[PDB]
Ligand binder design. Structure first.
Ligand code: FAD
Ligand code: FAD
Lengths: 115, 115
């Protein structure tokens, strides 16, 4: 019941996926070379400091198997959605439909259910 | 009432301070030179992509005025608490007592109110 407590692994995960998907949703459609480098490196550095060891190793192996595609906002928001679905699958959670990621993390649902 | 909606600036901020303070709380007490460099750069890259423009410019000016101290976990968790209090003050919110940051973001309150 006490809200201002350290978050657990699941709470830290929800915070972290919200931060990552939100950063992705606003990344440029046409990023410069340096922004593309900087986002890849951000993701790398995120995985280095993520404080759940099991999460982070798993994750660093995932990233080795599937490198951040930061060429454009489309590629990068989708890449990150595919990444997050691998973690969902690993954990027995259903796939998120990646075609909804702009709705979910930038624009809101088209039916107006977020307004 | 619909929970799976894009977060607003305040919601994105709570997610983001939770992610940052949590990363800090678990940073090493004796980080290697490369970890020290990597955390400074992480913070820099975070400020580059943070998607609230007003938040980010403000923030990039703050960081120019007061560089991330990543020499140790003590210095870095405190630095980040001081940073977050400047944003609190800017916004008319009261100071967070930085002496509580291990309790709040790693260990839980000493009275056991998080157990
Ligand atoms: C980088 C990272 C690695 C992690 N590794 C582990 C691990 O190894 N083991 C472990 O137990 N936990 C791990 N976690 C935590 C875990 O993924 C969940 O965050 C936590 O279990 C809470 O799950 P949840 O059901 O609340 O939804 P979350 O997975 O946290 O998702 C939050 C919301 O995002 C939306 N969403 C779901 N999937 C996608 C998607 N593919 N794309 C866009 N939006 C989506 C949905 O609205 C969902 O409610 C990791 C978290 C992160 C950020
Ligand atoms: C980097 C960054 C820059 C931002 N810039 C702006 C801006 O320019 N303008 C704007 O309107 N909003 C900005 N925000 C959002 C803003 O700071 C708040 O997150 C948002 O207004 C919600 O505030 P809150 O009252 O819910 O608590 P938050 O400030 O989000 O804090 C969440 C919790 O952290 C704990 N806490 C509070 N202070 C500290 C501290 N100093 N150290 C450790 N723990 C603490 C408390 O438990 C608090 O409830 C920024 C957010 C971030 C992450």
């Amino acid at each position: 019941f006490r809200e201002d407590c350290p978050p657990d692994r699941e709470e830290l995960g929800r915070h972290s996926w919200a931060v990552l998907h939100t950063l992705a949703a606003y990344y440029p459609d046409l990023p410069t070379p340096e922004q593309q480098q900087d986002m890849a490196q951000f993701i790398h550095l995120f995985s280095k400091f993520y404080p759940c060891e099991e999460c982070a190793e798993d994750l660093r192996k995932r990233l080795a198997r599937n490198h951040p595609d930061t060429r454009t906002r489309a590629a990068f928001t989708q890449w990150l959605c595919h990444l997050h679905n691998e973690v969902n699958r690993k954990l027995g959670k259903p796939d998120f439909d990646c075609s909804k990621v702009d709705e979910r993390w930038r624009d809101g649902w088209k039916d107006g259910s977020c307004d």
